[PDB]
Amino acid sequence: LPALIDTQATAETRALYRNLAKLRYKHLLFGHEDSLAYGVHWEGDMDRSDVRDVTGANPAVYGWELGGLELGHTANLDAVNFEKMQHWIKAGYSRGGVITISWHVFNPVSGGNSWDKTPAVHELIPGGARHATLKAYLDTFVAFNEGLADVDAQGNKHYPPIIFRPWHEHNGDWFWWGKGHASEQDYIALWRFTVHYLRDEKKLRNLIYAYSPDRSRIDMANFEAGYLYGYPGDAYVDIIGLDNYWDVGHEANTASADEQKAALTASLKQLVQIARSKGKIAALTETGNNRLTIDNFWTERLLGPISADADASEIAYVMVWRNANLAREKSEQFFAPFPGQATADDFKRFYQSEVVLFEDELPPLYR
Ligand code: NA
């Protein structure tokens, strides 16, 4: 009964959304960013994942990142080759996996990255002096998406559905499209234009749109109001997402473990209630414990709190961030384990949960 904002979405896109709406009550899809691109201790293999090396299974949800595409770069801001990315997207989809894409858009005013807070939203929205630049930027995704398509013998074009998750964590002040650097109304204009341009002007039919505030900058005593800062409206959102690294052991969080667990549960309960009220689907779109320093993280700090409340449990999926290559990037940053990593066995047991679905355990999501 949730319905997509694209009333003409492709059969497979409509099927995915319907199937997520059904599965969410008893299951949780596991996801990982850049899962096929590299791991902490490897890069180059065209069919490998840290997640699979540990569990024997690929993640159910594959996250990818477009930052730099808009500048005509051959690889994204983390040096992930766009052609390989298209290959990996098609591969994952072919196996029945789910595809989600975020976009750390470079600052069009300063030339800095997303974390350069130089204001720019006002320039990019309709009527702004750099509106043509926004169009140019979005066009690069249109072309990327075309690259994902297969054409059958009859000339019908087939695309992987994509959970497109733009302009994320906009309630934070760390991105140029964020609170403090863009007016709320201008942010809403940017979101609405993104939807109109992709869905209506360019006629992309394979997108599911995900909205994703950061939990750390939401007041738990006024959760809904915080969550809905810069919310563009029900006609522009399909997935009621949330990025929450805070309640899963962030080093700056002085709350006790028990208090954090309770907050994670409460955040997800409220997230679910919001999605239910709007006829949408909720998801924990980014989370994780950087460097996986927390014993039994998977069962105790993630699965446990998700499962501790009936409402909280109705999220459809959870994605953890990337496993940065140590040799290349020069320091440790990772959110899934790899063989030998402390939390690897707990992660296997997490996988073995009937609740948690990896790629190998998915029903047919696309019919
Ligand atoms: Na499982």
Side-chain angles (χ1 to χ4, degrees), residues 1-17 19-21 23-25 27-184 186-353 355-367:
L1 164 126
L4 290 169
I5 63 171
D6 190 353
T7 61
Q8 295 172 298
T10 73
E12 291 84 5
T13 304
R14 298 191 327 268
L16 174 61
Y17 195 63
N19 287 137
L20 289 178
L23 282 166
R24 64 190 159 161
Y25 300 103
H27 299 285
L28 180 74
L29 281 60
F30 175 73
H32 183 45
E33 186 73 7
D34 283 9
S35 203
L36 294 168
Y38 50 76
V40 180
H41 298 286
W42 71 270
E43 187 170 27
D45 198 310
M46 288 309 298
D47 183 27
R48 186 172 174 188
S49 165
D50 276 354
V51 166
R52 196 201 315 161
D53 289 342
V54 177
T55 65
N58 292 135
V61 175
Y62 295 92
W64 299 99
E65 162 61 43
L66 299 180
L69 184 70
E70 68 281 12
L71 304 180
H73 294 169
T74 60
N76 83 355
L77 75 173
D78 299 319
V80 183
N81 181 271
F82 285 122
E83 286 211 333
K84 295 184 175 177
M85 188 183 302
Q86 291 170 314
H87 171 88
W88 285 318
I89 287 170
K90 292 178 86 186
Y93 175 55
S94 80
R95 298 189 288 269
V98 180
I99 305 308
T100 188
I101 301 183
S102 59
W103 203 347
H104 287 75
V105 178
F106 281 78
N107 192 305
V109 173
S110 72
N113 59 27
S114 302
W115 295 265
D116 180 333
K117 301 159 184 193
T118 304
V121 172
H122 67 286
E123 291 270 296
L124 289 170
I125 60 176
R130 300 176 193 257
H131 184 57
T133 301
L134 182 54
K135 287 182 181 182
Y137 280 11
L138 296 178
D139 284 345
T140 70
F141 175 53
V142 174
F144 178 90
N145 189 53
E146 273 316 280
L148 300 177
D150 292 326
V151 187
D152 66 26
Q154 292 177 126
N156 303 120
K157 291 166 74 188
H158 305 278
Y159 301 77
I162 299 166
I163 297 170
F164 185 56
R165 188 174 63 93
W167 313 122
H168 65 302
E169 301 181 4
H170 63 286
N171 62 321
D173 71 332
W174 42 89
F175 298 140
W176 55 259
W177 56 84
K179 189 183 293 195
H181 313 116
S183 72
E184 191 177 3
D186 284 2
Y187 176 81
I188 290 164
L190 176 62
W191 185 286
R192 290 183 178 175
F193 176 77
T194 300
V195 173
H196 283 308
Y197 192 69
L198 293 179
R199 185 189 60 202
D200 301 325
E201 177 65 21
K202 294 297 186 172
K203 318 289 179 192
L204 275 65
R205 296 276 165 271
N206 61 305
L207 307 185
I208 302 177
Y209 296 85
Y211 174 81
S212 59
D214 167 75
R215 144 80 174 97
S216 77
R217 298 294 178 86
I218 296 180
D219 176 14
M220 291 299 294
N222 294 283
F223 185 93
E224 185 174 356
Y227 184 81
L228 294 176
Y229 176 87
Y231 182 77
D234 297 352
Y236 303 95
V237 175
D238 297 309
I239 289 167
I240 291 286
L242 187 71
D243 294 5
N244 189 350
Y245 297 87
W246 189 249
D247 300 321
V248 289
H250 193 285
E251 66 172 70
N253 191 351
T254 66
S256 74
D258 285 345
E259 288 179 323
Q260 293 188 26
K261 289 182 202 185
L264 178 54
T265 299
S267 71
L268 297 177
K269 177 180 191 74
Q270 290 178 98
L271 188 68
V272 167
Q273 289 168 334
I274 292 167
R276 183 185 297 148
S277 72
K278 296 177 167 303
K280 312 296 183 185
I281 300 171
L284 185 49
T285 50
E286 289 190 32
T287 192
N289 168 47
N290 207 336
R291 293 166 293 266
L292 284 165
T293 56
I294 296 176
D295 302 325
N296 299 323
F297 175 74
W298 301 100
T299 59
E300 291 187 16
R301 298 295 301 277
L302 204 52
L303 184 58
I306 292 172
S307 294
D309 175 89
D311 292 336
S313 72
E314 299 183 358
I315 58 161
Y317 65 90
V318 53
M319 193 181 84
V320 304
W321 207 241
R322 72 204 186 89
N323 278 23
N325 186 266
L326 177 57
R328 172 152 68 77
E329 299 204 17
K330 306 306 176 189
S331 62
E332 288 178 40
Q333 171 183 8
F334 59 89
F335 301 85
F338 48 83
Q341 202 281 324
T343 69
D345 290 341
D346 184 64
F347 187 66
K348 293 177 194 159
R349 292 188 287 272
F350 170 83
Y351 161 69
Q352 290 177 346
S353 167
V355 165
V356 182
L357 300 175
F358 283 40
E359 181 189 73
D360 62 330
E361 313 165 299
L362 292 171
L365 296 172
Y366 298 111
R367 42 174 198 260

